[PDB]
Amino acid sequence: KESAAAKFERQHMDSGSSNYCNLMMCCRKMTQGKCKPVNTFVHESLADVKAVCSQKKVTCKNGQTNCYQSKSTMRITDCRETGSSKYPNCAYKTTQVEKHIIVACGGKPSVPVHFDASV
């Protein structure tokens, strides 16, 4: 069983092409069983992303208060299923942007366990 912290790294970290999302959503296993409809990858170092857990506190989309917003914008790529996508033939639109990220943090040490939003 993968931990929540490990799952966050697999689904969202790509520390560092129109087909980017199609390749990554597949390699990171987000097209198994169903096409995850939307996902965001973050291209900053794992350390900079983990540091968000000690940055600005904000409320989570689900109402929990263990969420944090990055002090700076970060380089991210949003992957969104296209209208033609249909499991098991998933298809995604790749959009690169620079936005702040909001993540839920948990565990000891407190690390990101859920990508909540980009703002």
mmCIF file with all atom_site columns, C-alpha atoms in Angstrom:
data_model
loop_
_atom_site.group_PDB
_atom_site.id
_atom_site.type_symbol
_atom_site.label_atom_id
_atom_site.label_alt_id
_atom_site.label_comp_id
_atom_site.label_asym_id
_atom_site.label_entity_id
_atom_site.label_seq_id
_atom_site.pdbx_PDB_ins_code
_atom_site.Cartn_x
_atom_site.Cartn_y
_atom_site.Cartn_z
_atom_site.occupancy
_atom_site.B_iso_or_equiv
_atom_site.pdbx_formal_charge
_atom_site.auth_seq_id
_atom_site.auth_comp_id
_atom_site.auth_asym_id
_atom_site.auth_atom_id
_atom_site.pdbx_PDB_model_num
ATOM 1   C CA . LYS A 1 1   ? 0.000   0.000  0.000   1.00 0.00 ? 1   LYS A CA 1
ATOM 2   C CA . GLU A 1 2   ? 1.409   3.342  -1.082  1.00 0.00 ? 2   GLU A CA 1
ATOM 3   C CA . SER A 1 3   ? 1.457   6.076  1.566   1.00 0.00 ? 3   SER A CA 1
ATOM 4   C CA . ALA A 1 4   ? -0.398  9.348  0.990   1.00 0.00 ? 4   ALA A CA 1
ATOM 5   C CA . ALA A 1 5   ? 2.986   11.144 0.766   1.00 0.00 ? 5   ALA A CA 1
ATOM 6   C CA . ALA A 1 6   ? 4.256   8.674  -1.851  1.00 0.00 ? 6   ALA A CA 1
ATOM 7   C CA . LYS A 1 7   ? 1.009   8.937  -3.822  1.00 0.00 ? 7   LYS A CA 1
ATOM 8   C CA . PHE A 1 8   ? 1.375   12.757 -3.885  1.00 0.00 ? 8   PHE A CA 1
ATOM 9   C CA . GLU A 1 9   ? 4.896   12.454 -5.301  1.00 0.00 ? 9   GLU A CA 1
ATOM 10  C CA . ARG A 1 10  ? 3.763   9.968  -7.995  1.00 0.00 ? 10  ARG A CA 1
ATOM 11  C CA . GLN A 1 11  ? 0.701   11.984 -9.066  1.00 0.00 ? 11  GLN A CA 1
ATOM 12  C CA . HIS A 1 12  ? 2.133   15.482 -8.820  1.00 0.00 ? 12  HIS A CA 1
ATOM 13  C CA . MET A 1 13  ? 5.901   15.891 -8.859  1.00 0.00 ? 13  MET A CA 1
ATOM 14  C CA . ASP A 1 14  ? 7.931   16.219 -12.044 1.00 0.00 ? 14  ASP A CA 1
ATOM 15  C CA . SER A 1 15  ? 10.905  18.198 -10.803 1.00 0.00 ? 15  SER A CA 1
ATOM 16  C CA . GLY A 1 16  ? 12.453  19.762 -13.794 1.00 0.00 ? 16  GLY A CA 1
ATOM 17  C CA . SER A 1 17  ? 5.186   19.179 -25.924 1.00 0.00 ? 17  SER A CA 1
ATOM 18  C CA . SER A 1 18  ? 1.492   18.827 -26.461 1.00 0.00 ? 18  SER A CA 1
ATOM 19  C CA . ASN A 1 19  ? 1.718   15.169 -25.573 1.00 0.00 ? 19  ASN A CA 1
ATOM 20  C CA . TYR A 1 20  ? 3.244   15.676 -22.148 1.00 0.00 ? 20  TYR A CA 1
ATOM 21  C CA . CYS A 1 21  ? 0.024   14.883 -20.290 1.00 0.00 ? 21  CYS A CA 1
ATOM 22  C CA . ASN A 1 22  ? -0.771  11.829 -22.376 1.00 0.00 ? 22  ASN A CA 1
ATOM 23  C CA . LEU A 1 23  ? 2.663   10.327 -21.574 1.00 0.00 ? 23  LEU A CA 1
ATOM 24  C CA . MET A 1 24  ? 2.762   11.292 -17.869 1.00 0.00 ? 24  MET A CA 1
ATOM 25  C CA . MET A 1 25  ? -0.807  10.444 -16.946 1.00 0.00 ? 25  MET A CA 1
ATOM 26  C CA . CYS A 1 26  ? -0.048  6.988  -18.299 1.00 0.00 ? 26  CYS A CA 1
ATOM 27  C CA . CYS A 1 27  ? 3.445   6.477  -16.789 1.00 0.00 ? 27  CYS A CA 1
ATOM 28  C CA . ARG A 1 28  ? 2.327   7.777  -13.366 1.00 0.00 ? 28  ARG A CA 1
ATOM 29  C CA . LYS A 1 29  ? -0.559  5.304  -13.422 1.00 0.00 ? 29  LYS A CA 1
ATOM 30  C CA . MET A 1 30  ? -3.400  7.823  -13.422 1.00 0.00 ? 30  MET A CA 1
ATOM 31  C CA . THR A 1 31  ? -5.124  6.043  -16.362 1.00 0.00 ? 31  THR A CA 1
ATOM 32  C CA . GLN A 1 32  ? -5.619  2.649  -14.615 1.00 0.00 ? 32  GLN A CA 1
ATOM 33  C CA . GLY A 1 33  ? -9.220  1.682  -14.079 1.00 0.00 ? 33  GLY A CA 1
ATOM 34  C CA . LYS A 1 34  ? -10.395 5.057  -15.320 1.00 0.00 ? 34  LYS A CA 1
ATOM 35  C CA . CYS A 1 35  ? -9.023  8.270  -16.701 1.00 0.00 ? 35  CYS A CA 1
ATOM 36  C CA . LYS A 1 36  ? -8.281  10.664 -13.846 1.00 0.00 ? 36  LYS A CA 1
ATOM 37  C CA . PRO A 1 37  ? -10.166 13.721 -15.256 1.00 0.00 ? 37  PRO A CA 1
ATOM 38  C CA . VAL A 1 38  ? -7.805  16.508 -14.100 1.00 0.00 ? 38  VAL A CA 1
ATOM 39  C CA . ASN A 1 39  ? -4.306  16.477 -12.589 1.00 0.00 ? 39  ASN A CA 1
ATOM 40  C CA . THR A 1 40  ? -1.482  18.945 -11.970 1.00 0.00 ? 40  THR A CA 1
ATOM 41  C CA . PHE A 1 41  ? 2.297   18.264 -12.122 1.00 0.00 ? 41  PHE A CA 1
ATOM 42  C CA . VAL A 1 42  ? 4.734   20.623 -10.357 1.00 0.00 ? 42  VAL A CA 1
ATOM 43  C CA . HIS A 1 43  ? 8.148   21.320 -11.852 1.00 0.00 ? 43  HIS A CA 1
ATOM 44  C CA . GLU A 1 44  ? 9.951   22.588 -8.803  1.00 0.00 ? 44  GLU A CA 1
ATOM 45  C CA . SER A 1 45  ? 12.245  20.575 -6.555  1.00 0.00 ? 45  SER A CA 1
ATOM 46  C CA . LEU A 1 46  ? 10.734  18.219 -4.077  1.00 0.00 ? 46  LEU A CA 1
ATOM 47  C CA . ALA A 1 47  ? 12.328  20.344 -1.340  1.00 0.00 ? 47  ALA A CA 1
ATOM 48  C CA . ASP A 1 48  ? 10.615  23.534 -2.539  1.00 0.00 ? 48  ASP A CA 1
ATOM 49  C CA . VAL A 1 49  ? 7.280   21.758 -2.680  1.00 0.00 ? 49  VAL A CA 1
ATOM 50  C CA . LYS A 1 50  ? 7.694   20.186 0.772   1.00 0.00 ? 50  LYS A CA 1
ATOM 51  C CA . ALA A 1 51  ? 8.484   23.732 2.085   1.00 0.00 ? 51  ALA A CA 1
ATOM 52  C CA . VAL A 1 52  ? 4.952   24.779 1.249   1.00 0.00 ? 52  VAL A CA 1
ATOM 53  C CA . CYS A 1 53  ? 3.928   22.857 4.377   1.00 0.00 ? 53  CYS A CA 1
ATOM 54  C CA . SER A 1 54  ? 5.512   25.620 6.418   1.00 0.00 ? 54  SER A CA 1
ATOM 55  C CA . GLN A 1 55  ? 4.224   28.465 4.304   1.00 0.00 ? 55  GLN A CA 1
ATOM 56  C CA . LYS A 1 56  ? 0.784   30.196 4.206   1.00 0.00 ? 56  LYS A CA 1
ATOM 57  C CA . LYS A 1 57  ? -2.110  28.354 5.931   1.00 0.00 ? 57  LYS A CA 1
ATOM 58  C CA . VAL A 1 58  ? -5.423  28.381 4.059   1.00 0.00 ? 58  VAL A CA 1
ATOM 59  C CA . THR A 1 59  ? -8.609  26.317 4.176   1.00 0.00 ? 59  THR A CA 1
ATOM 60  C CA . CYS A 1 60  ? -8.865  23.105 2.093   1.00 0.00 ? 60  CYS A CA 1
ATOM 61  C CA . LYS A 1 61  ? -11.583 22.657 -0.537  1.00 0.00 ? 61  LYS A CA 1
ATOM 62  C CA . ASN A 1 62  ? -13.149 20.013 1.634   1.00 0.00 ? 62  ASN A CA 1
ATOM 63  C CA . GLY A 1 63  ? -13.212 22.283 4.729   1.00 0.00 ? 63  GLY A CA 1
ATOM 64  C CA . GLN A 1 64  ? -10.167 20.849 6.561   1.00 0.00 ? 64  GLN A CA 1
ATOM 65  C CA . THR A 1 65  ? -7.607  23.409 7.748   1.00 0.00 ? 65  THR A CA 1
ATOM 66  C CA . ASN A 1 66  ? -4.363  21.491 7.128   1.00 0.00 ? 66  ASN A CA 1
ATOM 67  C CA . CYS A 1 67  ? -3.783  23.171 3.742   1.00 0.00 ? 67  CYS A CA 1
ATOM 68  C CA . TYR A 1 68  ? -1.007  25.552 2.722   1.00 0.00 ? 68  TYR A CA 1
ATOM 69  C CA . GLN A 1 69  ? -0.490  27.883 -0.193  1.00 0.00 ? 69  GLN A CA 1
ATOM 70  C CA . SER A 1 70  ? 2.967   28.438 -1.762  1.00 0.00 ? 70  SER A CA 1
ATOM 71  C CA . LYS A 1 71  ? 4.475   31.865 -1.017  1.00 0.00 ? 71  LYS A CA 1
ATOM 72  C CA . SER A 1 72  ? 5.477   32.134 -4.710  1.00 0.00 ? 72  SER A CA 1
ATOM 73  C CA . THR A 1 73  ? 4.069   31.031 -8.005  1.00 0.00 ? 73  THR A CA 1
ATOM 74  C CA . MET A 1 74  ? 5.545   27.745 -9.260  1.00 0.00 ? 74  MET A CA 1
ATOM 75  C CA . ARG A 1 75  ? 5.932   26.230 -12.755 1.00 0.00 ? 75  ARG A CA 1
ATOM 76  C CA . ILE A 1 76  ? 3.136   23.705 -13.163 1.00 0.00 ? 76  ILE A CA 1
ATOM 77  C CA . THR A 1 77  ? 1.328   21.809 -15.966 1.00 0.00 ? 77  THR A CA 1
ATOM 78  C CA . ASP A 1 78  ? -2.446  21.136 -15.740 1.00 0.00 ? 78  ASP A CA 1
ATOM 79  C CA . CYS A 1 79  ? -3.650  17.975 -17.502 1.00 0.00 ? 79  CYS A CA 1
ATOM 80  C CA . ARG A 1 80  ? -7.347  17.872 -18.386 1.00 0.00 ? 80  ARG A CA 1
ATOM 81  C CA . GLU A 1 81  ? -9.213  15.040 -20.101 1.00 0.00 ? 81  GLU A CA 1
ATOM 82  C CA . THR A 1 82  ? -10.358 16.048 -23.572 1.00 0.00 ? 82  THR A CA 1
ATOM 83  C CA . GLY A 1 83  ? -13.924 15.572 -24.838 1.00 0.00 ? 83  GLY A CA 1
ATOM 84  C CA . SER A 1 84  ? -12.696 12.640 -26.978 1.00 0.00 ? 84  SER A CA 1
ATOM 85  C CA . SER A 1 85  ? -11.118 10.818 -24.068 1.00 0.00 ? 85  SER A CA 1
ATOM 86  C CA . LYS A 1 86  ? -12.812 7.516  -23.315 1.00 0.00 ? 86  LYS A CA 1
ATOM 87  C CA . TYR A 1 87  ? -11.304 4.827  -21.082 1.00 0.00 ? 87  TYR A CA 1
ATOM 88  C CA . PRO A 1 88  ? -9.128  2.842  -21.729 1.00 0.00 ? 88  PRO A CA 1
ATOM 89  C CA . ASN A 1 89  ? -8.122  5.309  -24.437 1.00 0.00 ? 89  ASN A CA 1
ATOM 90  C CA . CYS A 1 90  ? -7.581  8.378  -22.200 1.00 0.00 ? 90  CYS A CA 1
ATOM 91  C CA . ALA A 1 91  ? -6.637  11.716 -23.779 1.00 0.00 ? 91  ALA A CA 1
ATOM 92  C CA . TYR A 1 92  ? -5.458  14.980 -22.222 1.00 0.00 ? 92  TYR A CA 1
ATOM 93  C CA . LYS A 1 93  ? -4.981  18.665 -23.013 1.00 0.00 ? 93  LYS A CA 1
ATOM 94  C CA . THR A 1 94  ? -1.599  19.933 -21.655 1.00 0.00 ? 94  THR A CA 1
ATOM 95  C CA . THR A 1 95  ? -1.514  23.519 -20.280 1.00 0.00 ? 95  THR A CA 1
ATOM 96  C CA . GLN A 1 96  ? 1.700   24.962 -18.769 1.00 0.00 ? 96  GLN A CA 1
ATOM 97  C CA . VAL A 1 97  ? 1.190   27.884 -16.333 1.00 0.00 ? 97  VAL A CA 1
ATOM 98  C CA . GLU A 1 98  ? 2.833   29.652 -13.397 1.00 0.00 ? 98  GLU A CA 1
ATOM 99  C CA . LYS A 1 99  ? 0.506   29.704 -10.392 1.00 0.00 ? 99  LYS A CA 1
ATOM 100 C CA . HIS A 1 100 ? 0.560   29.246 -6.655  1.00 0.00 ? 100 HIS A CA 1
ATOM 101 C CA . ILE A 1 101 ? -0.236  25.710 -5.407  1.00 0.00 ? 101 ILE A CA 1
ATOM 102 C CA . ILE A 1 102 ? -2.294  24.751 -2.384  1.00 0.00 ? 102 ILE A CA 1
ATOM 103 C CA . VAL A 1 103 ? -1.585  21.331 -0.823  1.00 0.00 ? 103 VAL A CA 1
ATOM 104 C CA . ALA A 1 104 ? -2.829  19.466 2.221   1.00 0.00 ? 104 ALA A CA 1
ATOM 105 C CA . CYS A 1 105 ? 0.015   18.426 4.524   1.00 0.00 ? 105 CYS A CA 1
ATOM 106 C CA . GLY A 1 106 ? 0.094   15.594 7.002   1.00 0.00 ? 106 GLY A CA 1
ATOM 107 C CA . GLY A 1 107 ? 2.292   13.158 8.873   1.00 0.00 ? 107 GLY A CA 1
ATOM 108 C CA . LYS A 1 108 ? 5.395   13.671 11.040  1.00 0.00 ? 108 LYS A CA 1
ATOM 109 C CA . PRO A 1 109 ? 7.291   15.380 9.460   1.00 0.00 ? 109 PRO A CA 1
ATOM 110 C CA . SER A 1 110 ? 4.357   17.253 7.861   1.00 0.00 ? 110 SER A CA 1
ATOM 111 C CA . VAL A 1 111 ? 4.651   16.713 4.099   1.00 0.00 ? 111 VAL A CA 1
ATOM 112 C CA . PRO A 1 112 ? 2.247   17.236 1.157   1.00 0.00 ? 112 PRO A CA 1
ATOM 113 C CA . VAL A 1 113 ? -0.443  14.509 1.025   1.00 0.00 ? 113 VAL A CA 1
ATOM 114 C CA . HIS A 1 114 ? -2.942  16.030 -1.433  1.00 0.00 ? 114 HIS A CA 1
ATOM 115 C CA . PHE A 1 115 ? -2.840  18.551 -4.268  1.00 0.00 ? 115 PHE A CA 1
ATOM 116 C CA . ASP A 1 116 ? -5.750  20.833 -3.454  1.00 0.00 ? 116 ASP A CA 1
ATOM 117 C CA . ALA A 1 117 ? -5.687  23.619 -6.017  1.00 0.00 ? 117 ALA A CA 1
ATOM 118 C CA . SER A 1 118 ? -3.581  26.069 -8.037  1.00 0.00 ? 118 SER A CA 1
ATOM 119 C CA . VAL A 1 119 ? -4.392  29.737 -7.658  1.00 0.00 ? 119 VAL A CA 1
#
